[PDB]
Amino acid sequence: SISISYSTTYSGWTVADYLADWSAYFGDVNHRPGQVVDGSNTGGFNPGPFDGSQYALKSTASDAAFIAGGDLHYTLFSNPSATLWGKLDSIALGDTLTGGAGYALDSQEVSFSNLGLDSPIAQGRDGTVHKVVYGLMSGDSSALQGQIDALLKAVDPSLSINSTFDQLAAAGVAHATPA
């Protein structure tokens, strides 16, 4: 079942409000045709170069960053091209990316783990893993939100992305860490 870690700063926040805030502050890195710049808005894999247990990306607007964890593969130019696929077990959100091939966030705000998301290569860019991560890269947490909402309801059908982190802690899903 999904497990969430949150800084006590966010106890009274809803998951949706947190995600919409973080995504707006991270912004859109403009990873799209004609706009990809190696070393600026590609992010990186650990161990990489195009596969690993982590994919991490820093904002180009702010100090926000995220780390996706699991078993992740990027097809680059191979068919189906520009597809991230594999198993997505976790998403960590916060600021100030450190490390590398592991990555960590200096300020880890919220992490969602045991996501259990998996997308085979055959689904291409329509895979859930691709859509969740590419959404974050593009300033849009909607895909992530939809997956979190379904996972929460699978544990306890009255929970949702409009639950506060404290409500999720009372339901046994979330765990606070010191600010």
Contacts with ligand HEM by CB under 6 A lie at 31-33, 36, 42-45, 50, 55, 74, 81-82, 84, 125, 130, 133-134, 137
What is Dmax (Cα atoms) for the chain? 47
| Type of residue at 102 | G
| Partner interacting with residue 158 (select from ligand HEM, Zn ion, none; CB below 5-8 Å by kind) | Zn ion
When binding is defined by CB under 5 A, the residue of 96, 158, 162, 177 that contacts Zn ion is 158
What CA–CA distance (Å, rounded) separates 41 from 108? 21
End-to-end CA distance of the chain: 25
- Contact map string, positions 47 to 86, toward Zn ion, x by CB under 5 A: ------------------------x---------------
DSSP-assigned letters across all residues of 131-147: HHHHHHHTT--HHHHHH
Binding site for Zn ion (CB under 5 A): 28, 33, 71, 95, 118, 138, 156, 158, 175
